[PDB]
mmCIF file of C-alpha atoms and ligand atoms in Angstrom:
data_model
loop_
_atom_site.group_PDB
_atom_site.id
_atom_site.type_symbol
_atom_site.label_atom_id
_atom_site.label_comp_id
_atom_site.label_asym_id
_atom_site.label_seq_id
_atom_site.Cartn_x
_atom_site.Cartn_y
_atom_site.Cartn_z
ATOM 1 C CA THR D 3 -12.602 -7.945 -27.699
ATOM 2 C CA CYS D 4 -12.736 -9.362 -24.126
ATOM 3 C CA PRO D 5 -9.337 -10.820 -23.109
ATOM 4 C CA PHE D 6 -9.090 -14.479 -22.070
ATOM 5 C CA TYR D 7 -7.988 -13.498 -18.541
ATOM 6 C CA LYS D 8 -11.459 -11.903 -18.008
ATOM 7 C CA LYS D 9 -13.291 -15.121 -18.945
ATOM 8 C CA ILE D 10 -13.962 -18.121 -16.739
ATOM 9 C CA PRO D 11 -13.704 -21.515 -18.657
ATOM 10 C CA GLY D 12 -16.768 -23.798 -18.747
ATOM 11 C CA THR D 13 -19.235 -21.116 -17.724
ATOM 12 C CA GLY D 14 -21.129 -18.207 -19.237
ATOM 13 C CA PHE D 15 -19.285 -15.963 -16.730
ATOM 14 C CA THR D 16 -17.005 -12.922 -17.170
ATOM 15 C CA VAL D 17 -15.189 -10.847 -14.468
ATOM 16 C CA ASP D 18 -14.728 -7.096 -14.657
ATOM 17 C CA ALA D 19 -15.527 -7.024 -18.405
ATOM 18 C CA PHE D 20 -18.063 -4.208 -18.853
ATOM 19 C CA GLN D 21 -16.320 -2.218 -21.542
ATOM 20 C CA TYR D 22 -16.607 -4.450 -24.652
ATOM 21 C CA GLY D 23 -20.376 -4.503 -25.297
ATOM 22 C CA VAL D 24 -22.211 -7.846 -25.141
ATOM 23 C CA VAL D 25 -19.708 -10.710 -24.836
ATOM 24 C CA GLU D 26 -21.010 -13.719 -26.820
ATOM 25 C CA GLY D 27 -22.076 -16.556 -24.434
ATOM 26 C CA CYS D 28 -21.931 -14.494 -21.274
ATOM 27 C CA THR D 29 -24.968 -15.248 -19.071
ATOM 28 C CA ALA D 30 -23.437 -13.250 -16.178
ATOM 29 C CA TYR D 31 -21.126 -10.291 -15.653
ATOM 30 C CA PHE D 32 -19.332 -10.338 -12.240
ATOM 31 C CA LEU D 33 -17.897 -7.065 -10.845
ATOM 32 C CA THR D 34 -15.219 -7.456 -8.111
ATOM 33 C CA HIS D 35 -15.353 -3.818 -6.803
ATOM 34 C CA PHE D 36 -16.334 -0.206 -7.502
ATOM 35 C CA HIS D 37 -13.148 1.195 -9.133
ATOM 36 C CA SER D 38 -13.560 2.826 -12.607
ATOM 37 C CA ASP D 39 -11.020 0.614 -14.468
ATOM 38 C CA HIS D 40 -12.998 -2.468 -13.386
ATOM 39 C CA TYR D 41 -16.489 -1.007 -13.898
ATOM 40 C CA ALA D 42 -15.783 1.064 -17.089
ATOM 41 C CA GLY D 43 -18.959 0.605 -19.185
ATOM 42 C CA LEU D 44 -21.864 0.026 -16.709
ATOM 43 C CA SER D 45 -24.808 2.527 -16.729
ATOM 44 C CA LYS D 46 -28.558 2.663 -16.076
ATOM 45 C CA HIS D 47 -29.009 0.753 -19.404
ATOM 46 C CA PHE D 48 -27.569 -2.644 -18.403
ATOM 47 C CA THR D 49 -30.156 -5.436 -18.604
ATOM 48 C CA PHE D 50 -27.949 -8.463 -17.887
ATOM 49 C CA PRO D 51 -27.389 -9.800 -14.417
ATOM 50 C CA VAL D 52 -24.510 -8.245 -12.459
ATOM 51 C CA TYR D 53 -23.359 -10.268 -9.539
ATOM 52 C CA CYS D 54 -21.443 -8.361 -6.932
ATOM 53 C CA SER D 55 -21.313 -7.715 -3.127
ATOM 54 C CA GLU D 56 -24.160 -5.798 -1.385
ATOM 55 C CA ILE D 57 -21.894 -2.757 -1.074
ATOM 56 C CA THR D 58 -20.906 -2.777 -4.723
ATOM 57 C CA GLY D 59 -24.607 -3.038 -5.519
ATOM 58 C CA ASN D 60 -25.522 0.071 -3.484
ATOM 59 C CA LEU D 61 -22.886 1.983 -5.518
ATOM 60 C CA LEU D 62 -24.235 0.606 -8.773
ATOM 61 C CA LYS D 63 -27.825 1.673 -7.874
ATOM 62 C CA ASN D 64 -27.003 5.090 -6.368
ATOM 63 C CA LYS D 65 -23.879 6.353 -8.253
ATOM 64 C CA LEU D 66 -24.337 4.768 -11.700
ATOM 65 C CA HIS D 67 -28.149 4.238 -11.344
ATOM 66 C CA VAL D 68 -28.475 0.580 -12.410
ATOM 67 C CA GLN D 69 -32.000 -0.899 -11.865
ATOM 68 C CA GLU D 70 -32.522 -2.931 -8.647
ATOM 69 C CA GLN D 71 -33.548 -6.186 -10.436
ATOM 70 C CA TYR D 72 -30.263 -6.572 -12.416
ATOM 71 C CA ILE D 73 -28.064 -6.083 -9.410
ATOM 72 C CA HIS D 74 -27.770 -9.443 -7.756
ATOM 73 C CA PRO D 75 -25.903 -8.755 -4.560
ATOM 74 C CA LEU D 76 -24.620 -11.896 -2.784
ATOM 75 C CA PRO D 77 -23.566 -12.339 0.866
ATOM 76 C CA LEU D 78 -19.944 -13.115 1.572
ATOM 77 C CA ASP D 79 -18.694 -16.455 2.966
ATOM 78 C CA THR D 80 -21.842 -18.258 1.838
ATOM 79 C CA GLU D 81 -22.096 -21.095 -0.672
ATOM 80 C CA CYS D 82 -24.335 -19.759 -3.464
ATOM 81 C CA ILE D 83 -25.698 -21.322 -6.627
ATOM 82 C CA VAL D 84 -25.498 -19.076 -9.740
ATOM 83 C CA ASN D 85 -26.956 -20.721 -12.855
ATOM 84 C CA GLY D 86 -26.187 -24.096 -11.336
ATOM 85 C CA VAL D 87 -22.578 -23.163 -10.637
ATOM 86 C CA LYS D 88 -21.507 -22.961 -7.000
ATOM 87 C CA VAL D 89 -19.681 -19.657 -6.275
ATOM 88 C CA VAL D 90 -18.443 -18.007 -3.091
ATOM 89 C CA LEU D 91 -17.511 -14.369 -2.522
ATOM 90 C CA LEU D 92 -14.689 -13.710 -0.037
ATOM 91 C CA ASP D 93 -13.343 -10.405 1.377
ATOM 92 C CA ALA D 94 -10.487 -9.103 -0.757
ATOM 93 C CA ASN D 95 -9.010 -6.663 1.901
ATOM 94 C CA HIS D 96 -8.995 -3.977 -0.894
ATOM 95 C CA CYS D 97 -11.646 -1.169 -0.742
ATOM 96 C CA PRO D 98 -15.198 -1.363 0.805
ATOM 97 C CA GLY D 99 -17.290 -4.022 -1.056
ATOM 98 C CA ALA D 100 -14.263 -5.595 -2.800
ATOM 99 C CA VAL D 101 -14.376 -9.379 -3.164
ATOM 100 C CA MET D 102 -12.508 -12.369 -4.517
ATOM 101 C CA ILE D 103 -14.632 -15.091 -6.190
ATOM 102 C CA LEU D 104 -14.331 -18.944 -5.802
ATOM 103 C CA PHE D 105 -15.809 -20.724 -8.873
ATOM 104 C CA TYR D 106 -16.652 -24.481 -8.518
ATOM 105 C CA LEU D 107 -16.830 -25.884 -12.107
ATOM 106 C CA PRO D 108 -19.112 -28.952 -12.925
ATOM 107 C CA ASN D 109 -16.060 -30.844 -14.214
ATOM 108 C CA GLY D 110 -14.295 -30.507 -10.805
ATOM 109 C CA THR D 111 -11.910 -27.643 -11.499
ATOM 110 C CA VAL D 112 -11.741 -24.927 -8.791
ATOM 111 C CA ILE D 113 -10.778 -21.363 -9.789
ATOM 112 C CA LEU D 114 -10.007 -18.326 -7.541
ATOM 113 C CA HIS D 115 -10.165 -14.875 -8.971
ATOM 114 C CA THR D 116 -8.631 -12.369 -6.513
ATOM 115 C CA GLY D 117 -9.985 -9.226 -8.137
ATOM 116 C CA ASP D 118 -7.856 -6.426 -6.571
ATOM 117 C CA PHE D 119 -6.511 -7.683 -3.189
ATOM 118 C CA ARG D 120 -4.096 -7.148 -0.340
ATOM 119 C CA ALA D 121 -3.052 -10.620 0.541
ATOM 120 C CA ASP D 122 -3.215 -11.441 4.285
ATOM 121 C CA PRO D 123 -2.679 -14.479 6.625
ATOM 122 C CA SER D 124 -6.357 -14.309 7.725
ATOM 123 C CA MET D 125 -7.234 -15.609 4.200
ATOM 124 C CA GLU D 126 -5.320 -18.833 4.965
ATOM 125 C CA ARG D 127 -8.034 -19.716 7.576
ATOM 126 C CA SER D 128 -11.012 -18.852 5.327
ATOM 127 C CA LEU D 129 -13.086 -21.230 3.141
ATOM 128 C CA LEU D 130 -9.972 -21.572 0.947
ATOM 129 C CA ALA D 131 -8.371 -23.671 3.754
ATOM 130 C CA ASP D 132 -10.953 -26.414 2.923
ATOM 131 C CA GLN D 133 -9.986 -27.414 -0.718
ATOM 132 C CA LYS D 134 -7.652 -27.431 -3.711
ATOM 133 C CA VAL D 135 -7.538 -24.532 -6.174
ATOM 134 C CA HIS D 136 -6.266 -25.473 -9.630
ATOM 135 C CA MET D 137 -6.282 -21.992 -11.324
ATOM 136 C CA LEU D 138 -5.487 -18.583 -9.820
ATOM 137 C CA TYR D 139 -6.417 -15.316 -11.516
ATOM 138 C CA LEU D 140 -3.990 -12.965 -9.636
ATOM 139 C CA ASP D 141 -3.699 -9.196 -8.934
ATOM 140 C CA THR D 142 -0.126 -8.623 -10.009
ATOM 141 C CA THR D 143 0.050 -4.838 -9.400
ATOM 142 C CA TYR D 144 3.269 -5.093 -7.165
ATOM 143 C CA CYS D 145 4.831 -8.357 -8.410
ATOM 144 C CA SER D 146 8.524 -7.266 -8.107
ATOM 145 C CA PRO D 147 10.785 -7.391 -5.050
ATOM 146 C CA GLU D 148 11.428 -3.612 -4.934
ATOM 147 C CA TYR D 149 7.771 -3.201 -3.862
ATOM 148 C CA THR D 150 7.837 -3.178 -0.101
ATOM 149 C CA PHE D 151 5.688 -0.873 1.987
ATOM 150 C CA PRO D 152 4.566 -0.738 5.665
ATOM 151 C CA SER D 153 1.474 -2.338 7.274
ATOM 152 C CA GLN D 154 -1.769 -0.358 7.209
ATOM 153 C CA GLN D 155 -1.763 -0.307 11.066
ATOM 154 C CA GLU D 156 1.815 1.209 11.126
ATOM 155 C CA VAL D 157 0.686 3.911 8.778
ATOM 156 C CA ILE D 158 -2.543 4.702 10.719
ATOM 157 C CA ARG D 159 -0.258 5.102 13.789
ATOM 158 C CA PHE D 160 1.971 7.734 12.037
ATOM 159 C CA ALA D 161 -1.138 9.593 10.896
ATOM 160 C CA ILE D 162 -2.968 9.659 14.230
ATOM 161 C CA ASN D 163 0.308 11.004 15.686
ATOM 162 C CA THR D 164 1.197 13.717 13.121
ATOM 163 C CA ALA D 165 -2.397 15.068 13.247
ATOM 164 C CA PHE D 166 -2.985 15.027 16.991
ATOM 165 C CA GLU D 167 0.458 16.660 17.560
ATOM 166 C CA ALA D 168 -0.124 19.672 15.315
ATOM 167 C CA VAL D 169 -3.751 20.241 16.345
ATOM 168 C CA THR D 170 -2.765 20.272 20.019
ATOM 169 C CA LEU D 171 0.237 22.580 19.233
ATOM 170 C CA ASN D 172 -1.882 24.909 17.029
ATOM 171 C CA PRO D 173 -5.619 24.555 17.744
ATOM 172 C CA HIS D 174 -6.461 26.732 14.648
ATOM 173 C CA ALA D 175 -4.914 24.304 12.107
ATOM 174 C CA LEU D 176 -7.018 22.215 9.682
ATOM 175 C CA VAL D 177 -6.270 18.561 8.759
ATOM 176 C CA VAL D 178 -6.939 17.788 5.052
ATOM 177 C CA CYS D 179 -6.870 14.278 3.511
ATOM 178 C CA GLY D 180 -6.769 13.718 -0.324
ATOM 179 C CA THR D 181 -9.075 11.159 -2.086
ATOM 180 C CA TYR D 182 -10.270 10.207 -5.674
ATOM 181 C CA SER D 183 -12.112 6.898 -5.400
ATOM 182 C CA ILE D 184 -13.360 4.668 -2.574
ATOM 183 C CA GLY D 185 -10.636 3.097 -0.515
ATOM 184 C CA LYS D 186 -8.438 4.199 2.323
ATOM 185 C CA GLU D 187 -11.343 5.529 4.484
ATOM 186 C CA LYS D 188 -9.503 4.376 7.586
ATOM 187 C CA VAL D 189 -6.953 7.283 7.139
ATOM 188 C CA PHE D 190 -9.520 10.033 7.602
ATOM 189 C CA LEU D 191 -11.784 8.169 9.998
ATOM 190 C CA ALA D 192 -8.866 7.445 12.315
ATOM 191 C CA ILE D 193 -7.573 11.062 12.337
ATOM 192 C CA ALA D 194 -11.064 12.543 12.973
ATOM 193 C CA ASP D 195 -11.614 10.076 15.762
ATOM 194 C CA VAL D 196 -8.412 11.322 17.556
ATOM 195 C CA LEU D 197 -9.407 15.008 17.000
ATOM 196 C CA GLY D 198 -12.915 14.719 18.426
ATOM 197 C CA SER D 199 -14.499 15.630 15.027
ATOM 198 C CA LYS D 200 -16.622 14.482 12.103
ATOM 199 C CA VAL D 201 -15.097 14.449 8.604
ATOM 200 C CA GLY D 202 -16.397 17.174 6.240
ATOM 201 C CA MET D 203 -16.725 16.608 2.503
ATOM 202 C CA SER D 204 -18.544 17.604 -0.706
ATOM 203 C CA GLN D 205 -22.162 16.402 -1.239
ATOM 204 C CA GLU D 206 -20.978 13.790 -3.840
ATOM 205 C CA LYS D 207 -18.414 12.181 -1.476
ATOM 206 C CA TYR D 208 -20.914 12.146 1.373
ATOM 207 C CA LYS D 209 -23.283 10.294 -1.019
ATOM 208 C CA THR D 210 -20.619 7.721 -1.910
ATOM 209 C CA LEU D 211 -19.762 7.125 1.798
ATOM 210 C CA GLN D 212 -23.380 6.628 2.800
ATOM 211 C CA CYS D 213 -23.513 3.549 0.451
ATOM 212 C CA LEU D 214 -20.714 1.597 2.262
ATOM 213 C CA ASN D 215 -22.529 0.048 5.333
ATOM 214 C CA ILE D 216 -19.999 1.608 7.687
ATOM 215 C CA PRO D 217 -21.406 1.263 11.232
ATOM 216 C CA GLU D 218 -22.367 4.566 12.994
ATOM 217 C CA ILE D 219 -21.539 6.502 9.809
ATOM 218 C CA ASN D 220 -24.042 9.319 10.604
ATOM 219 C CA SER D 221 -21.954 10.226 13.659
ATOM 220 C CA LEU D 222 -18.655 10.221 11.649
ATOM 221 C CA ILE D 223 -19.281 12.343 8.554
ATOM 222 C CA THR D 224 -20.974 15.668 7.617
ATOM 223 C CA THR D 225 -21.453 18.038 4.603
ATOM 224 C CA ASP D 226 -21.134 21.016 6.930
ATOM 225 C CA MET D 227 -17.478 22.128 6.284
ATOM 226 C CA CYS D 228 -17.689 24.951 8.881
ATOM 227 C CA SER D 229 -18.404 22.521 11.739
ATOM 228 C CA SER D 230 -15.447 20.125 11.092
ATOM 229 C CA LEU D 231 -11.641 20.126 11.359
ATOM 230 C CA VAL D 232 -10.862 17.148 9.194
ATOM 231 C CA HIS D 233 -11.788 17.917 5.586
ATOM 232 C CA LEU D 234 -11.608 15.704 2.426
ATOM 233 C CA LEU D 235 -10.631 17.145 -0.973
ATOM 234 C CA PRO D 236 -10.027 15.754 -4.481
ATOM 235 C CA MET D 237 -6.477 14.431 -4.863
ATOM 236 C CA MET D 238 -6.028 16.758 -7.917
ATOM 237 C CA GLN D 239 -6.619 19.657 -5.525
ATOM 238 C CA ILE D 240 -3.954 18.563 -2.897
ATOM 239 C CA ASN D 241 -1.217 21.047 -3.898
ATOM 240 C CA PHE D 242 -0.169 24.579 -2.899
ATOM 241 C CA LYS D 243 -2.106 26.687 -5.451
ATOM 242 C CA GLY D 244 -5.185 24.461 -4.847
ATOM 243 C CA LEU D 245 -4.784 24.338 -1.033
ATOM 244 C CA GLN D 246 -4.254 28.110 -0.946
ATOM 245 C CA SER D 247 -7.507 28.419 -2.932
ATOM 246 C CA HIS D 248 -9.264 26.197 -0.360
ATOM 247 C CA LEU D 249 -7.652 27.884 2.663
ATOM 248 C CA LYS D 250 -9.220 31.170 1.449
ATOM 249 C CA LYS D 251 -12.744 29.679 1.237
ATOM 250 C CA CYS D 252 -12.837 28.692 4.888
ATOM 251 C CA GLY D 253 -13.026 32.409 5.746
ATOM 252 C CA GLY D 254 -10.293 33.160 8.283
ATOM 253 C CA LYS D 255 -11.182 30.185 10.482
ATOM 254 C CA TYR D 256 -7.863 28.301 10.305
ATOM 255 C CA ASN D 257 -4.308 29.647 10.074
ATOM 256 C CA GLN D 258 -2.588 26.402 8.954
ATOM 257 C CA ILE D 259 -3.425 23.251 6.931
ATOM 258 C CA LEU D 260 -1.797 19.876 7.499
ATOM 259 C CA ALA D 261 -2.528 17.538 4.577
ATOM 260 C CA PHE D 262 -2.027 13.825 3.899
ATOM 261 C CA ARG D 263 -1.728 12.231 0.444
ATOM 262 C CA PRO D 264 -2.281 8.505 0.903
ATOM 263 C CA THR D 265 -0.541 7.114 -2.169
ATOM 264 C CA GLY D 266 0.576 3.681 -3.336
ATOM 265 C CA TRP D 267 4.241 2.907 -3.889
ATOM 266 C CA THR D 268 6.596 5.709 -4.947
ATOM 267 C CA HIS D 269 10.386 5.496 -5.510
ATOM 268 C CA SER D 270 11.055 7.095 -2.073
ATOM 269 C CA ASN D 271 9.913 3.700 -0.548
ATOM 270 C CA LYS D 272 13.298 2.369 -1.773
ATOM 271 C CA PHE D 273 15.345 4.691 0.529
ATOM 272 C CA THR D 274 13.129 6.148 3.347
ATOM 273 C CA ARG D 275 11.164 4.439 6.175
ATOM 274 C CA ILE D 276 7.652 5.527 7.423
ATOM 275 C CA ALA D 277 8.899 6.844 10.825
ATOM 276 C CA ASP D 278 11.350 9.145 8.938
ATOM 277 C CA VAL D 279 8.800 10.886 6.647
ATOM 278 C CA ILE D 280 8.738 14.616 5.698
ATOM 279 C CA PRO D 281 6.384 16.934 3.707
ATOM 280 C CA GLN D 282 6.892 19.594 1.039
ATOM 281 C CA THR D 283 6.401 23.139 2.463
ATOM 282 C CA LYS D 284 5.441 26.411 0.700
ATOM 283 C CA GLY D 285 4.561 28.660 3.649
ATOM 284 C CA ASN D 286 1.860 27.517 6.135
ATOM 285 C CA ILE D 287 0.622 24.480 4.033
ATOM 286 C CA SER D 288 2.403 21.085 4.681
ATOM 287 C CA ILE D 289 1.631 18.139 2.353
ATOM 288 C CA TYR D 290 2.501 14.574 3.514
ATOM 289 C CA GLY D 291 2.753 11.568 1.218
ATOM 290 C CA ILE D 292 2.022 8.380 3.201
ATOM 291 C CA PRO D 293 2.181 4.968 1.539
ATOM 292 C CA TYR D 294 -1.118 3.383 2.595
ATOM 293 C CA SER D 295 -1.498 0.460 0.163
ATOM 294 C CA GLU D 296 -4.658 -1.573 -0.650
ATOM 295 C CA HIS D 297 -2.657 -4.022 -2.865
ATOM 296 C CA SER D 298 -0.293 -6.844 -1.850
ATOM 297 C CA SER D 299 3.448 -6.105 -1.332
ATOM 298 C CA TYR D 300 5.730 -8.568 -3.147
ATOM 299 C CA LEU D 301 6.284 -10.548 0.093
ATOM 300 C CA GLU D 302 2.556 -10.654 0.959
ATOM 301 C CA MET D 303 1.691 -11.897 -2.551
ATOM 302 C CA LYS D 304 4.535 -14.466 -2.508
ATOM 303 C CA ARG D 305 3.397 -15.955 0.794
ATOM 304 C CA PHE D 306 -0.258 -16.230 -0.253
ATOM 305 C CA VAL D 307 0.648 -17.949 -3.587
ATOM 306 C CA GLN D 308 3.137 -20.366 -1.895
ATOM 307 C CA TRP D 309 0.433 -21.356 0.614
ATOM 308 C CA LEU D 310 -2.214 -21.797 -2.104
ATOM 309 C CA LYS D 311 0.009 -23.904 -4.405
ATOM 310 C CA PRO D 312 -2.151 -23.290 -7.446
ATOM 311 C CA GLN D 313 -1.470 -25.633 -10.398
ATOM 312 C CA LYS D 314 -1.674 -22.615 -12.722
ATOM 313 C CA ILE D 315 -1.425 -18.709 -12.428
ATOM 314 C CA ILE D 316 -3.101 -16.127 -14.732
ATOM 315 C CA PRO D 317 -2.036 -12.487 -14.181
ATOM 316 C CA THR D 318 -4.671 -9.758 -14.424
ATOM 317 C CA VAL D 319 -2.371 -6.654 -14.021
ATOM 318 C CA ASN D 320 0.653 -5.471 -15.988
ATOM 319 C CA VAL D 321 -0.206 -7.975 -18.733
ATOM 320 C CA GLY D 322 -0.029 -5.444 -21.566
ATOM 321 C CA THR D 323 3.688 -5.869 -22.445
ATOM 322 C CA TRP D 324 5.777 -8.977 -23.150
ATOM 323 C CA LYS D 325 8.546 -7.765 -20.813
ATOM 324 C CA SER D 326 6.220 -7.508 -17.807
ATOM 325 C CA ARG D 327 4.622 -10.851 -18.688
ATOM 326 C CA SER D 328 8.046 -12.511 -18.873
ATOM 327 C CA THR D 329 9.355 -11.013 -15.605
ATOM 328 C CA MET D 330 6.225 -12.177 -13.801
ATOM 329 C CA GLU D 331 6.594 -15.781 -15.070
ATOM 330 C CA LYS D 332 10.153 -15.919 -13.774
ATOM 331 C CA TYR D 333 8.986 -15.016 -10.196
ATOM 332 C CA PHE D 334 6.143 -17.603 -10.454
ATOM 333 C CA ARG D 335 8.753 -20.232 -11.413
ATOM 334 C CA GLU D 336 11.034 -19.338 -8.429
ATOM 335 C CA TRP D 337 8.115 -19.481 -6.023
ATOM 336 C CA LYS D 338 7.125 -22.947 -7.288
ATOM 337 C CA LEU D 339 10.690 -24.321 -7.119
ATOM 338 C CA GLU D 340 11.204 -22.975 -3.570
ATOM 339 C CA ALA D 341 7.938 -24.310 -2.317
ATOM 340 C CA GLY D 342 7.993 -27.772 -3.924
ATOM 341 C CA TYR D 343 4.641 -27.563 -5.749
HETATM 342 NI NI1 NI C 401 -8.878 -1.398 -7.315
#
């Protein structure tokens, strides 16, 4: 049964709730972004409206094969009427096509649902700057002060450096980047840019990338592995036995891999900086973990919430245990007492 934190009061609307069957009263099923936890359930056999971004809609039509009529894409940053409820979609700074949704209820309540987001100061000069938000449905993935991690630009720096170093030192080395969903495309696009290359990938990943409205994408990516020296592989496969396997396939064309595992937080964020990173090493394969996050750090989240001064906060992540719920409420209370709202 659909949880209350996936329903919007005073509407027939639900958010990311595609895995329960029909939800009684639901005129509309919103989908914030194309990640399997949020979309779990959709297929070609949906015949209710889905409202989402254009990019999420391309993925619905081409990867899940939903029929064009039931995908209502909406532009971003545009006031839109949806069953005589005003809504706006705003960029979530998550993966491609990820949005937050502003709901303007008839009764005068305003609700923001963040979907998955990496909070940023550029959001403080968006359409949110214009009016009061009473209820916040909040991505609480890293709501604890241990969760720090670097900026995405800092990390793309490290990467462009490691890669360009090694390739210039050994011109027969391959760069590999791990992936398992959309997100984090900047890692591989940035490295390939510095190496004078396209990125090579499976047919299925090529298909996924061609749905994202990336400008100039035909010049950036290829399914011809042979012709490329930045390759993408499944994240499952980014290990020694699996990278050995792959290093064979390339047919004596490279004598060293240098891999990157963009990950979220790990416990080695607590004791090691990004400039002082190392990889595991079993022979000529060298696997880097680099903490490129598409969720808010604790500080980033804190700042956004203290700016917004919502009257009420509804967590959407880590809500499955009483201990996590309780810990989260305590931080929300501190933030409110500090900030005077
Ligand atoms: Ni996500």
